[PDB]
Design a binder for these strands. Structure first.
Ligand code: MET
Ligand SMILES: [K+]
Ligand SMILES: [K+]
Ligand SMILES: [K+]
Ligand SMILES: [K+]
Ligand SMILES: [K+]
Ligand SMILES: [K+]
Ligand SMILES: [K+]
Ligand SMILES: [K+]
Ligand SMILES: [K+]
Ligand SMILES: [K+]
Ligand SMILES: [K+]
Ligand SMILES: [Mg+2]
Ligand SMILES: [Mg+2]
Ligand SMILES: [Mg+2]
Ligand SMILES: [Mg+2]
Ligand SMILES: [Mg+2]
Ligand SMILES: [Mg+2]
Ligand SMILES: [Mg+2]
Ligand SMILES: [Mg+2]
Ligand SMILES: [Mg+2]
Ligand SMILES: [Mg+2]
Ligand SMILES: [Mg+2]
Ligand SMILES: [Mg+2]
Ligand SMILES: [Mg+2]
Ligand SMILES: [Mg+2]
Ligand SMILES: [Mg+2]
Ligand SMILES: [Mg+2]
Ligand SMILES: [Mg+2]
Ligand SMILES: [Mg+2]
Ligand SMILES: [Mg+2]
Ligand SMILES: [Mg+2]
Ligand SMILES: [Mg+2]
Ligand SMILES: [Mg+2]
Ligand SMILES: [Mg+2]
Ligand SMILES: [Mg+2]
Ligand SMILES: [Mg+2]
Ligand SMILES: [Mg+2]
Ligand SMILES: [Mg+2]
Ligand SMILES: [Mg+2]
Ligand SMILES: [Mg+2]
Ligand SMILES: [Mg+2]
Ligand SMILES: [Mg+2]
Ligand SMILES: [Mg+2]
Ligand SMILES: [Mg+2]
Ligand SMILES: [Mg+2]
Ligand SMILES: [Mg+2]
Ligand SMILES: [Mg+2]
Ligand SMILES: [Mg+2]
Ligand SMILES: [Mg+2]
Ligand SMILES: [Mg+2]
Ligand SMILES: [Mg+2]
Ligand SMILES: [Mg+2]
Ligand SMILES: [Mg+2]
Ligand SMILES: [Mg+2]
Ligand SMILES: [Mg+2]
Ligand SMILES: [Mg+2]
Ligand SMILES: [Mg+2]
Ligand SMILES: [Mg+2]
Ligand SMILES: [Mg+2]
Ligand SMILES: [Mg+2]
Ligand SMILES: [Mg+2]
Ligand SMILES: [Mg+2]
Ligand SMILES: [Mg+2]
Ligand SMILES: [Mg+2]
Ligand SMILES: [Mg+2]
Ligand SMILES: [Mg+2]
Ligand SMILES: [Mg+2]
Ligand SMILES: [Mg+2]
Ligand SMILES: [Mg+2]
Ligand SMILES: [Mg+2]
Ligand SMILES: [Mg+2]
Ligand SMILES: [Mg+2]
Ligand SMILES: [Mg+2]
Ligand SMILES: [Mg+2]
Ligand SMILES: [Mg+2]
Ligand SMILES: [Mg+2]
Ligand SMILES: [Mg+2]
Ligand SMILES: [Mg+2]
Ligand SMILES: [Mg+2]
Ligand SMILES: [Mg+2]
Ligand SMILES: [Mg+2]
Ligand SMILES: [Mg+2]
Ligand SMILES: [Mg+2]
Ligand SMILES: [Mg+2]
Lengths: 70, 381
RNA sequence: AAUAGGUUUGGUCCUAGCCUUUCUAUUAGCUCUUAGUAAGAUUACACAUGCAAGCAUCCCCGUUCCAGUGAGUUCACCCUCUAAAUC
RNA sequence: GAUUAACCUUUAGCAAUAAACGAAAGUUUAACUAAGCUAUACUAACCCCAGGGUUGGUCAAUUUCGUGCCAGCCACCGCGGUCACAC
RNA sequence: CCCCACUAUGCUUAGCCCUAAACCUCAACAGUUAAAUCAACAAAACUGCUCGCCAGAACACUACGAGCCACAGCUUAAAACUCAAAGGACCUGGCGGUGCUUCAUAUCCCUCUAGAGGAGCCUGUUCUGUAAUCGAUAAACCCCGAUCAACCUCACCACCUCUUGCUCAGCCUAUAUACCGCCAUCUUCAGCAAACCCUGAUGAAGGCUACAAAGUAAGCGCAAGUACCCACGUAAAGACGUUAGGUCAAGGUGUAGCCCAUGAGGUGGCAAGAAAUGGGCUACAUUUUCUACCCCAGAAAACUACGAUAGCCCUUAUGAAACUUAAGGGUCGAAGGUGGAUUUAGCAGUAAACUGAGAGUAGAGUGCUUAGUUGAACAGGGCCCUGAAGCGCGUACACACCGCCCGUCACCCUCCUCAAGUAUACUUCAAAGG
RNA sequence: AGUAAGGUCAGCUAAAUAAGCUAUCGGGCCCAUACCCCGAAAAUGUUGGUUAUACCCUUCCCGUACUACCA
RNA sequence: AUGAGG
C-alpha cells in the first residue's frame, strides 16, 4: 500500500508542531488564565456544598488547596 | 437610426418641456421684475437652454416642411405629376439629410463633457492567472505592443515605465506612460479584462496544438500632477509656551516651545527640543511642512478618487470587455456587440483598432442620451 | 431500509457515502367549475367591543363542569389501603 | 394589532344531544346543533370550460431558431467556449 | 547528500516520561479440512464462545473539557464550514538518473577522413523599417511551397474605374480544429488484425516451452519478386497508428461570412537593413599561383604575392521597359593568415576533389536534379557514456516523466477557535429560618 | 546651528593599467526555460585648479555622520 | 532543477 494516508498525517503533524513552537508562549498565557478560572470554579463548587447544607462558613480548620499548580 | 429615437414619445415630451420652460424664462425676464440674484440664475438657465431651444425650433420647422411637402404632392394632378414629383423627391431627400443632422446636433448637445479629457494615462497590462501554459503571458505581449503601436498611430508619446518579460518570450506585467491630447478619452474604455481564444503556435503552449482560452487585465489610470506645498502665514497660528522638562530656571521664564496650528487642516505641531524659540520654530515649521506635504499628497489622491465617484459609473476593473478569437478571426466587443475581422491587422494598433474605439465612443454617447431622457422622464412625471 | 437505480477510475473488482425512484404533511409560484363531508392562527406575544352561568317560593345547589392551550414535564398505568361522591 | 413561509364569520338556535337547576310544567348554556369562509384532504359530477411541471442519463417524452464557458440550467452525473436533444 | 573536528545523547545509579510501521497491521479458548474452498492481493477456507473495536472523506494523532511527577507533552476526543468522492486490490500501457544479458557498424563511446561555427560574398529566416502579401517556422522550418518575383507573376499597397460582372456569377475571405487530395515523422521499425477457440470461478484482460504445457488464423506490412551493372549494393517499398503534424494560397469542398464588394479592371509603387542567424560559394596559398600542356616544363612566391562571383566604370545578351537580370572587359587588391564554446556527413568506387548536362525562363541562382573522372583513411576494441532487444523489478503516471505533486509568502472568500474588558439576556434562592 | 566624512560599469565592491562579480547583450547547450559554456559591452557626483593628470585640493549638489552643554 | 492549458 502507498503511504498517501501517512503523508497527510505527516504534514499535519509537522505543521502542528511548528505552529505550537511558534506560539507556545501565547498558549502558555491562555493556559495560565484557564487554570486560575479552573481553581476559582472548583472553589465555588466546594463553597456551594456547605452553604446549601446550612453552614454559614466553611468547617473550622478547612482550607481549599490549590490542586491546579506546580 | 437617430430618427427612430426622436419618434419615441419620451424624447418628444421632454423637448416640449424645455421649449415651454425656455419661453417661460423669457417672459419673466421681460415683464416680471426679478431680483438681481434671481435674475442671474434665470439668465444662466436661459443661456444654457438657448442652444437646445434653437435646435428644437429648427427641428419643428423641418418637420412642418415635410408635412407641407407631402400635402402638396397629394393635391397634384396626374397630367403634371411627373415633373413636379421629381423635384419634390429631391427637396424631400435634402430635408431628410438636414433633419438627420439636426437630430445628430441635438443629440450631441445633450451629451455632457468629461473632466479627464487630456490627462496622461499610466497604462498597465498584467497576464491573468486563468489557465496553464504561457498563453495568458504570451497574449499580454501582443496587447502591450498593440497599445504601443496605437500611440504611434495617434502621434502619442509612449514612455516605458516597467517591463517584466516572461520566461517564454512573453510578458508578465508591464507599465507605461502615454502623453498627448485626448489620451484618456480614447483609452478609458480599454480598461478591463481581455479574453483570447487561439491555438498556440509560438511558445511553451505550442507543444500541444489545442485551442486554449486565456485572460489578461488592462488598467487605465489618469496621471496626477506635482505636489508643491506653500504655507501662507495668514493660515498659520503661532503659539508660544514654556517647555516641559528639567532645564533649571531658563525654561521657567522663557517660552521656548512653539506650537503651530494650520487653520485649514487643523494639524498641530509642537517642538521643544532646542533652547531657542527661533531654533524650535524653524524645526516646528519643518515638521508642519512635512506633515502637510503628506496631506496635500493625500489631498491630491483623495480628490482623484472622488472625482469620478460622484458620477454613476461601473467599476471598470474586472470585466470581459473584448474577446480575441483567433480561431474564427474575429475580435468581439461584448459591450457594444461590435465584431472586427482580421485580428492580425487589429493587433497592429492601426486603422482597425481606431474604428472599434470610435464605435465605442458613438455607442457610449448614444447610451448617455438615453439615460438623460429616462432621468428627465421621472422628473417630468 | 426495496425487485432496486445513478455516481469514485484510463479500465475492472470490492467497499463506501451522497442522490434518484415510493407515500404523506405544511408553505410558495402559477392555475382553479359545482356539490357533499372532513379539517383549519405561526406565536404560553399584546388585546378594542359583544357574548360564553345560571336556576329557583328566598336557603342551598351550579358557576371546581364543558370549552381552550402545549409553557412546563417520567403526578397518567398496576397493586395495597381508604376519604369524598352515586345507590 | 404585532409577529410568522403559515392568516376562517366581530352568524343563527337552545329544536336534538350533553351539562346546571327545579318536585314539576320548564329555564339558561359561543358546549353542541344547523349555517358562513378556505383546493388542505376525501367522495361525486360537469353542454361549454385545463392548467402546472418536465423532455442529456438515472427517468416517460424536442422541432426550428436565438445565445456563444456569455446569458443561464441541474436532485445526482453534468451542460453552456458561433452545428446546444441539457440555456 | 560527501569529508573532518567536537557537544547533548547512547553507558552506570536513583527518580521520571508512557510514545512507535509497540506490525507477525492477522484477538483469547476449544475445534474442523467436509460442503458452497474462495471478490482481489497477502500468510488456504471456516465452526463454537466471549471480550475489545469499527460505521463516507477531510477538518482531526485538532479545538474545548477532564486526568496525569507530564507544562513546546501524553491519554480521552468534538463541532461548524467544505467535497461527491475518499479508500483497498488489480489489468494494460507508458516511464524509471531501473537490474541482468546480448548488441549497435557511419555508429553509442574510443578511433578514421573532410567540413560548419571566424572572414568576404551569394541566398533564406528572425527582428527593425516601409502606405505595402501569405504559408513553413524542435527533431519532422530556414536555396522551404519557388525545377525561381524588374512589368507580368501577384495574392500586397496608393489612386482610379466597373456592377447579372470571362462563368445559369464571383472571393488567394475565416476555419488544415470539418475534410478530400499529396506528404512529413517514428520507419536506419515489424508489427497490425477480421473470424473462432480456450484460460482467469464466464472481471479489466491473457494465450508460450519443440524430449512442447491452448492456441488456429484469411488479409496488410516485412519478406519474396521487380528496376539499375549480378544473387551484391543502391533505389523503390515501408502496414495500423503517433504528433487535432504540413497544405482552405495546386485544385475541389463542409460550415460561416461578403454581394455598390471581403468581387472585377487599369496606372503607379513595394520589396529595404540597426542588428542577429541557418545553408552554401570562394578563400586564407607551396600537395600553392600563372601559362603551355592535359601529368618529365618555365615562371610566380608577402604591401605590385595569394585572395571578391563585392564596389565603381564600360560593353554586350534578353526585353516594350535593365542604376535593377545575366555574361564579358577595365579598374579596384579589401577582410581573410585555417577559425571560441559547439556541431555535420561518410563503410568503397563511399568520403574528398574536379568536370559536364538537364529541368524552369524572353532573360535570370553561388540553388535543385543528374551523368562521369581521380580516389582514400579507420573498421579494431568497449558497455564507461547514449540507445535497442530479451527476461525481470518498481510505479501515487494514464493528457501517460515535457507526467504527477508538496509546503511557505502574497491574494480572495467562508467557517470556527482563542482572548483583557464591557454590555445584554438567561438560570438558581423560601426545598429556609426566627 | 555647527563639524566630520562619503560621492566610482545597470547594481555592488576592488583598484586608479579604472578590475572582478552579478546584471545586460550575442551565440552555444536543451523539445523549451534555468543552470552551464564562449564572447562582447558597460563608470570616477559635480566645479575649477593640480608640470600634466589620477587617487589630491577646491566649487557646487545629494545623502550620511556626530555635537548643540551648565546655571 | 523546471514544464501540460479547453
Ligand atoms: C540653578 O539651578 C542655580 N540657581 C543652582 C541651584 S542649586 C544650588
Ligand atoms: K451504491
Ligand atoms: K337551586
Ligand atoms: K408542552
Ligand atoms: K336544547
Ligand atoms: K397550494
Ligand atoms: K507495468
Ligand atoms: K570554418
Ligand atoms: K557556412
Ligand atoms: K501593375
Ligand atoms: K473553403
Ligand atoms: K493532465
Ligand atoms: Mg511497493
Ligand atoms: Mg493537511
Ligand atoms: Mg494544427
Ligand atoms: Mg448500484
Ligand atoms: Mg478511487
Ligand atoms: Mg489510477
Ligand atoms: Mg470518468
Ligand atoms: Mg477513456
Ligand atoms: Mg449506502
Ligand atoms: Mg346567545
Ligand atoms: Mg377539557
Ligand atoms: Mg381554536
Ligand atoms: Mg412549541
Ligand atoms: Mg364514604
Ligand atoms: Mg393553513
Ligand atoms: Mg330540557
Ligand atoms: Mg361547519
Ligand atoms: Mg429548467
Ligand atoms: Mg462535479
Ligand atoms: Mg444554435
Ligand atoms: Mg434533465
Ligand atoms: Mg430548452
Ligand atoms: Mg559524549
Ligand atoms: Mg517490535
Ligand atoms: Mg494494531
Ligand atoms: Mg483478549
Ligand atoms: Mg486455535
Ligand atoms: Mg481464487
Ligand atoms: Mg502521537
Ligand atoms: Mg493533543
Ligand atoms: Mg468538549
Ligand atoms: Mg487542553
Ligand atoms: Mg494506551
Ligand atoms: Mg524503458
Ligand atoms: Mg522496461
Ligand atoms: Mg554518422
Ligand atoms: Mg562563417
Ligand atoms: Mg490562410
Ligand atoms: Mg515571410
Ligand atoms: Mg504563420
Ligand atoms: Mg528565391
Ligand atoms: Mg510586381
Ligand atoms: Mg482578392
Ligand atoms: Mg479558389
Ligand atoms: Mg492536421
Ligand atoms: Mg499552419
Ligand atoms: Mg469458463
Ligand atoms: Mg486478445
Ligand atoms: Mg499469417
Ligand atoms: Mg537485393
Ligand atoms: Mg527510400
Ligand atoms: Mg520489400
Ligand atoms: Mg512540428
Ligand atoms: Mg485547399
Ligand atoms: Mg479556397
Ligand atoms: Mg466553399
Ligand atoms: Mg479588393
Ligand atoms: Mg487592384
Ligand atoms: Mg536546406
Ligand atoms: Mg584563383
Ligand atoms: Mg569584378
Ligand atoms: Mg537594348
Ligand atoms: Mg556581372
Ligand atoms: Mg595580386
Ligand atoms: Mg577547434
Ligand atoms: Mg546549371
Ligand atoms: Mg535551359
Ligand atoms: Mg536567384
Ligand atoms: Mg519533471
Ligand atoms: Mg501582504
Ligand atoms: Mg469565547
Ligand atoms: Mg543567454
Ligand atoms: Mg519555478
Amino acid at each position: 500500500k502507498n503511504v498517501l494516508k501517512i503523508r497527510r498525517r505527516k504534514m499535519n503533524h509537522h505543521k502542528y508542531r511548528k505552529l505550537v513552537k511558534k506560539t507556545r508562549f501565547l498558549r502558555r498565557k491562555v493556559q495560565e488564565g484557564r487554570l486560575r478560572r479552573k481553581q476559582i470554579k472548583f472553589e465555588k463548587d466546594l463553597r456551594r456544598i456547605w452553604l446549601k447544607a446550612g453552614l454559614k462558613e466553611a468547617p473550622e480548620g478547612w482550607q481549599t488547596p490549590k490542586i491546579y499548580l506546580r | 437610426d437617430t430618427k427612430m429615437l426622436w419618434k419615441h414619445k419620451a424624447l418628444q415630451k421632454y423637448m416640449e418641456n424645455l421649449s415651454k420652460e425656455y419661453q417661460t424664462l423669457e417672459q419673466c425676464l421681460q415683464h416680471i421684475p426679478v431680483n438681481e440674484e434671481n435674475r442671474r440664475s434665470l439668465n444662466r438657465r436661459h443661456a444654457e437652454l438657448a442652444p437646445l431651444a434653437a435646435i428644437y425650433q429648427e427641428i419643428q420647422e423641418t418637420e412642418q416642411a415635410i408635412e407641407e411637402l407631402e400635402s402638396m404632392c397629394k393635391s397634384l394632378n396626374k397630367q403634371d405629376e411627373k415633373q413636379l414629383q421629381e423635384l419634390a423627391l429631391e427637396e424631400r431627400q435634402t430635408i431628410d439629410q438636414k433633419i438627420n443632422m439636426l437630430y445628430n446636433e441635438l443629440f450631441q448637445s445633450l451629451v455632457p463633457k468629461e473632466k479627464y479629457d487630456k490627462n496622461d494615462v499610466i497604462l498597465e497590462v498584467t497576464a491573468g492567472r486563468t489557465t496553464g501554459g504561457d498563453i495568458c503571458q504570451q497574449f499580454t505581449r501582443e496587447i502591450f505592443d498593440m497599445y504601443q503601436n496605437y500611440s504611434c498611430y495617434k502621434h502619442w508619446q509612449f514612455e516605458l515605465l516597467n517591463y517584466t518579460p516572461a520566461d517564454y518570450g512573453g510578458l508578465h506585467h508591464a507599465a507605461a506612460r502615454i502623453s498627448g491630447d485626448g489620451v484618456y478619452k480614447h483609452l478609458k474604455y480599454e480598461g478591463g479584462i481581455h479574453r483570447v481564444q487561439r491555438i498556440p503556435e509560438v511558445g511553451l503552449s505550442s507543444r500541444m496544438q489545442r485551442i486554449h482560452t486565456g485572460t489578461m487585465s488592462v488598467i487605465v489610470l489618469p496621471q496626477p500632477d506635482e505636489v508643491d506645498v506653500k504655507l501662507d502665514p495668514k493660515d498659520l497660528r503661532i503659539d508660544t509656551f514654556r517647555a516641559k522638562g528639567a532645564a533649571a530656571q531658563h525654561v521657567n521664564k522663557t517660552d521656548s516651545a512653539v506650537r503651530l496650528v494650520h487653520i485649514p487642516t487643523g494639524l498641530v505641531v509642537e517642538c521643544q527640543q532646542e533652547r531657542s524659540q527661533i531654533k524650535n520654530k524653524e524645526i516646528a515649521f519643518r515638521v508642519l511642512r512635512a506633515r502637510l506635504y503628506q496631506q496635500i499628497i493625500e489631498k491630491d489622491k483623495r480628490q482623484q478618487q472622488s472625482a469620478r465617484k460622484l458620477q454613476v459609473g461601473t467599476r471598470a476593473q474586472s470585466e470581459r470587455i473584448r474577446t480575441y478569437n483567433f480561431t474564427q478571426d474575429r475580435v468581439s466587443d461584448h459591450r457594444i456587440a461590435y465584431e472586427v475581422r482580421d485580428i492580425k491587422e487589429f493587433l497592429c494598433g492601426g486603422k482597425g483598432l481606431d474604428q472599434l474605439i470610435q464605435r465605442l465612443l458613438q455607442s457610449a454617447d448614444e447610451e448617455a442620451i438615453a439615460e438623460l431622457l429616462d432621468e428627465h422622464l421621472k422628473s417630468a412625471k
